[PDB]
Amino acid sequence: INTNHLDKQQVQLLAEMCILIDENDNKIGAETKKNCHLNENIEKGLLHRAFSVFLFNTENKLLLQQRSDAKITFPGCFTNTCCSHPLSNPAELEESDALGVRRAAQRRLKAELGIPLEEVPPEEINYLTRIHYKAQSDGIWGEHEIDYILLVRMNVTLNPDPNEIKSYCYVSKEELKELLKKAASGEIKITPWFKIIAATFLFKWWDNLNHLNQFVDHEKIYRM
Ligand SMILES: [Mg+2]
Ligand SMILES: [Mg+2]
Ligand SMILES: [Mn+2]
Protein backbone atom coordinates (compact mmCIF):
# COMPACT_ATOMS: atom_id res chain seq x y z
CA ILE A 1 0.00 0.00 0.00
CA ASN A 2 0.51 3.57 -0.42
CA THR A 3 2.89 5.71 1.55
CA ASN A 4 1.97 8.98 -0.10
CA HIS A 5 0.17 10.56 2.85
CA LEU A 6 3.42 10.19 4.87
CA ASP A 7 6.56 12.31 5.41
CA LYS A 8 9.17 11.96 2.63
CA GLN A 9 12.30 11.65 4.76
CA GLN A 10 10.59 9.00 6.89
CA VAL A 11 9.52 7.14 3.78
CA GLN A 12 13.01 6.99 2.46
CA LEU A 13 14.04 5.32 5.70
CA LEU A 14 11.57 2.56 4.98
CA ALA A 15 13.99 1.05 2.50
CA GLU A 16 16.46 0.26 5.29
CA MET A 17 17.07 -3.45 5.81
CA CYS A 18 16.23 -4.80 9.31
CA ILE A 19 17.28 -8.11 10.90
CA LEU A 20 14.59 -10.79 10.88
CA ILE A 21 14.98 -13.03 13.98
CA ASP A 22 13.31 -16.09 15.46
CA GLU A 23 11.76 -15.97 18.93
CA ASN A 24 15.23 -16.60 20.43
CA ASP A 25 16.95 -13.65 18.70
CA ASN A 26 18.75 -15.84 16.15
CA LYS A 27 19.03 -14.15 12.71
CA ILE A 28 16.75 -15.70 10.07
CA GLY A 29 16.73 -13.13 7.27
CA ALA A 30 16.60 -9.50 6.25
CA GLU A 31 13.56 -7.38 5.42
CA THR A 32 12.79 -3.72 4.72
CA LYS A 33 11.74 -1.50 7.63
CA LYS A 34 8.42 -0.97 5.87
CA ASN A 35 7.52 -4.68 5.57
CA CYS A 36 8.72 -5.28 9.14
CA HIS A 37 6.26 -2.66 10.37
CA LEU A 38 3.11 -3.67 8.54
CA ASN A 39 0.59 -5.33 10.85
CA GLU A 40 -0.35 -7.64 7.95
CA ASN A 41 3.24 -8.95 7.97
CA ILE A 42 3.56 -9.07 11.78
CA GLU A 43 0.39 -11.22 11.72
CA LYS A 44 2.38 -13.59 9.49
CA GLY A 45 4.96 -13.95 12.28
CA LEU A 46 7.45 -11.30 11.13
CA LEU A 47 9.73 -10.26 14.04
CA HIS A 48 12.84 -7.99 13.87
CA ARG A 49 15.81 -6.90 16.07
CA ALA A 50 15.68 -3.52 17.79
CA PHE A 51 17.23 -1.37 20.51
CA SER A 52 16.12 1.16 23.15
CA VAL A 53 18.54 3.65 24.68
CA PHE A 54 17.99 5.28 28.07
CA LEU A 55 20.46 8.15 28.52
CA PHE A 56 20.94 9.72 31.96
CA ASN A 57 23.03 12.87 32.50
CA THR A 58 25.36 13.35 35.51
CA GLU A 59 22.50 14.86 37.53
CA ASN A 60 20.90 11.39 36.98
CA LYS A 61 18.12 12.84 34.80
CA LEU A 62 16.67 10.70 32.01
CA LEU A 63 16.65 12.29 28.55
CA LEU A 64 13.23 11.84 27.03
CA GLN A 65 12.16 12.56 23.49
CA GLN A 66 8.82 13.30 21.87
CA ARG A 67 8.52 11.69 18.47
CA SER A 68 7.80 14.20 15.68
CA ASP A 69 4.43 14.15 13.91
CA ALA A 70 6.41 12.86 10.87
CA LYS A 71 7.07 9.43 12.38
CA ILE A 72 5.04 6.68 10.74
CA THR A 73 4.66 4.67 13.94
CA PHE A 74 3.61 6.41 17.21
CA PRO A 75 3.98 10.07 16.18
CA GLY A 76 3.67 12.67 18.92
CA CYS A 77 4.52 10.08 21.58
CA PHE A 78 6.83 10.60 24.57
CA THR A 79 9.45 7.91 24.93
CA ASN A 80 12.96 7.08 26.11
CA THR A 81 16.09 8.67 24.68
CA CYS A 82 16.34 6.89 21.30
CA CYS A 83 15.04 3.72 19.63
CA SER A 84 15.74 2.02 16.32
CA HIS A 85 16.92 -1.14 14.60
CA PRO A 86 20.35 -2.59 13.93
CA LEU A 87 20.74 -2.70 10.15
CA SER A 88 21.22 -5.84 8.15
CA ASN A 89 24.83 -4.95 7.31
CA PRO A 90 28.14 -6.54 8.53
CA ALA A 91 28.82 -3.63 10.90
CA GLU A 92 25.51 -3.99 12.70
CA LEU A 93 24.93 -7.72 12.38
CA GLU A 94 27.99 -8.21 14.60
CA GLU A 95 26.94 -10.34 17.55
CA SER A 96 30.21 -10.52 19.49
CA ASP A 97 29.40 -8.59 22.71
CA ALA A 98 26.22 -7.24 21.07
CA LEU A 99 28.57 -4.86 19.28
CA GLY A 100 26.27 -4.54 16.27
CA VAL A 101 23.40 -3.10 18.33
CA ARG A 102 25.70 -0.77 20.30
CA ARG A 103 27.06 0.55 16.98
CA ALA A 104 23.48 1.03 15.73
CA ALA A 105 22.62 3.01 18.89
CA GLN A 106 25.67 5.25 18.47
CA ARG A 107 24.66 5.83 14.84
CA ARG A 108 21.03 6.70 15.72
CA LEU A 109 21.96 8.87 18.68
CA LYS A 110 23.87 10.94 16.15
CA ALA A 111 21.11 10.87 13.52
CA GLU A 112 18.18 11.56 15.85
CA LEU A 113 19.74 13.82 18.50
CA GLY A 114 22.84 15.19 16.83
CA ILE A 115 25.02 13.66 19.53
CA PRO A 116 28.58 13.42 18.14
CA LEU A 117 29.70 9.80 17.67
CA GLU A 118 32.69 10.54 19.90
CA GLU A 119 30.55 11.49 22.88
CA VAL A 120 29.00 8.00 23.00
CA PRO A 121 31.36 5.29 21.74
CA PRO A 122 30.04 1.74 21.78
CA GLU A 123 31.89 0.93 25.06
CA GLU A 124 29.91 3.53 26.93
CA ILE A 125 26.66 1.84 26.01
CA ASN A 126 25.51 -0.71 28.56
CA TYR A 127 23.47 -3.57 27.14
CA LEU A 128 21.27 -4.80 30.01
CA THR A 129 18.71 -7.27 28.70
CA ARG A 130 16.14 -7.99 25.97
CA ILE A 131 12.37 -7.68 25.86
CA HIS A 132 9.98 -9.26 23.33
CA TYR A 133 6.82 -7.20 22.64
CA LYS A 134 4.08 -6.66 20.04
CA ALA A 135 2.09 -3.42 19.76
CA GLN A 136 -0.01 -1.65 17.11
CA SER A 137 0.37 2.03 16.17
CA ASP A 138 -2.77 2.08 14.05
CA GLY A 139 -4.59 -0.43 11.84
CA ILE A 140 -1.74 -0.53 9.32
CA TRP A 141 1.50 0.05 11.18
CA GLY A 142 2.90 -1.55 14.33
CA GLU A 143 5.84 -3.10 16.06
CA HIS A 144 7.07 -6.62 16.79
CA GLU A 145 10.57 -6.72 18.19
CA ILE A 146 13.06 -8.28 20.51
CA ASP A 147 14.35 -5.01 21.96
CA TYR A 148 17.89 -4.63 23.32
CA ILE A 149 17.80 -2.33 26.39
CA LEU A 150 20.76 0.02 26.45
CA LEU A 151 21.82 2.39 29.20
CA VAL A 152 24.19 5.35 28.85
CA ARG A 153 25.42 7.81 31.55
CA MET A 154 26.98 10.77 29.79
CA ASN A 155 26.69 14.53 29.51
CA VAL A 156 26.00 15.12 25.81
CA THR A 157 25.64 18.00 23.34
CA LEU A 158 22.29 18.10 21.58
CA ASN A 159 21.13 19.26 18.18
CA PRO A 160 18.22 16.99 17.39
CA ASP A 161 16.55 16.51 13.97
CA PRO A 162 13.06 18.17 14.03
CA ASN A 163 12.00 15.56 11.47
CA GLU A 164 12.66 12.82 14.05
CA ILE A 165 11.96 14.63 17.30
CA LYS A 166 9.27 17.18 18.24
CA SER A 167 10.73 18.03 21.63
CA TYR A 168 13.01 16.58 24.28
CA CYS A 169 13.61 17.06 28.00
CA TYR A 170 15.61 15.70 30.94
CA VAL A 171 13.46 14.44 33.83
CA SER A 172 14.03 13.45 37.44
CA LYS A 173 12.41 10.29 38.81
CA GLU A 174 9.53 12.33 40.20
CA GLU A 175 9.04 14.34 37.00
CA LEU A 176 8.71 11.10 35.02
CA LYS A 177 6.15 9.75 37.50
CA GLU A 178 4.26 13.03 36.95
CA LEU A 179 4.55 12.60 33.16
CA LEU A 180 3.36 8.98 33.40
CA LYS A 181 0.23 10.19 35.23
CA LYS A 182 -0.53 12.62 32.39
CA ALA A 183 -0.14 9.71 29.96
CA ALA A 184 -2.43 7.45 32.04
CA SER A 185 -5.08 10.18 32.04
CA GLY A 186 -4.83 10.85 28.26
CA GLU A 187 -3.21 14.31 28.49
CA ILE A 188 -0.15 13.18 26.54
CA LYS A 189 0.80 9.94 24.77
CA ILE A 190 3.64 7.51 25.41
CA THR A 191 4.93 4.66 23.24
CA PRO A 192 3.89 1.13 24.24
CA TRP A 193 7.47 -0.07 24.84
CA PHE A 194 8.22 2.89 27.12
CA LYS A 195 5.06 2.11 29.12
CA ILE A 196 6.22 -1.52 29.40
CA ILE A 197 9.75 -0.65 30.60
CA ALA A 198 8.58 2.21 32.87
CA ALA A 199 6.08 -0.07 34.62
CA THR A 200 8.54 -2.95 34.97
CA PHE A 201 12.29 -2.26 34.95
CA LEU A 202 13.04 1.44 34.72
CA PHE A 203 12.73 2.73 38.29
CA LYS A 204 14.72 -0.25 39.64
CA TRP A 205 17.59 0.50 37.23
CA TRP A 206 17.26 4.22 38.02
CA ASP A 207 17.74 3.67 41.76
CA ASN A 208 20.82 1.58 41.01
CA LEU A 209 22.75 3.45 38.28
CA ASN A 210 26.09 2.86 40.04
CA HIS A 211 25.44 -0.90 40.36
CA LEU A 212 23.87 -1.96 37.05
CA ASN A 213 25.35 -5.43 37.08
CA GLN A 214 22.73 -7.20 39.18
CA PHE A 215 20.44 -6.26 36.28
CA VAL A 216 22.58 -7.53 33.39
CA ASP A 217 20.81 -10.59 31.90
CA HIS A 218 22.12 -11.58 28.48
CA GLU A 219 20.41 -14.98 28.54
CA LYS A 220 16.73 -14.30 29.27
CA ILE A 221 14.34 -12.74 26.78
CA TYR A 222 11.52 -11.17 28.77
CA ARG A 223 8.09 -11.70 27.14
CA MET A 224 5.73 -8.74 27.44
MG1 LIG B 1 13.91 6.20 16.52
MG1 LIG C 1 32.50 -11.35 15.71
MN1 LIG D 1 10.66 -1.93 14.94
UniProtKB/Swiss-Prot annotation:
It comes from the Eukaryota. InterPro entries: IsopentenylPP_isomerase_typ1, NUDIX_hydrolase-like_dom_sf, NUDIX_hydrolase_dom. Keywords: Acetylation, Cholesterol biosynthesis, Cholesterol metabolism, Isomerase, Isoprene biosynthesis, Lipid biosynthesis, Lipid metabolism, Magnesium, Metal-binding, Peroxisome, Steroid biosynthesis, Steroid metabolism, Sterol biosynthesis, Sterol metabolism. Substrate binds at residues 33, 67, 71, 84. This is Isopentenyl-diphosphate Delta-isomerase 1. It comes from Homo sapiens. Belongs to the IPP isomerase type 1 family. It is an enzyme of class 5 (isomerase). The modification N6-acetyllysine is found at residue 173. Pathway: Isoprenoid biosynthesis; dimethylallyl diphosphate biosynthesis; dimethylallyl diphosphate from isopentenyl diphosphate: step 1/1. Pfam families: NUDIX. Mg(2+) binds at residues 37, 48, 143, 145. Signal peptide: none annotated. Binds 1 Mg(2+) ion per subunit. Monomer. Its cofactor is Mg(2+).
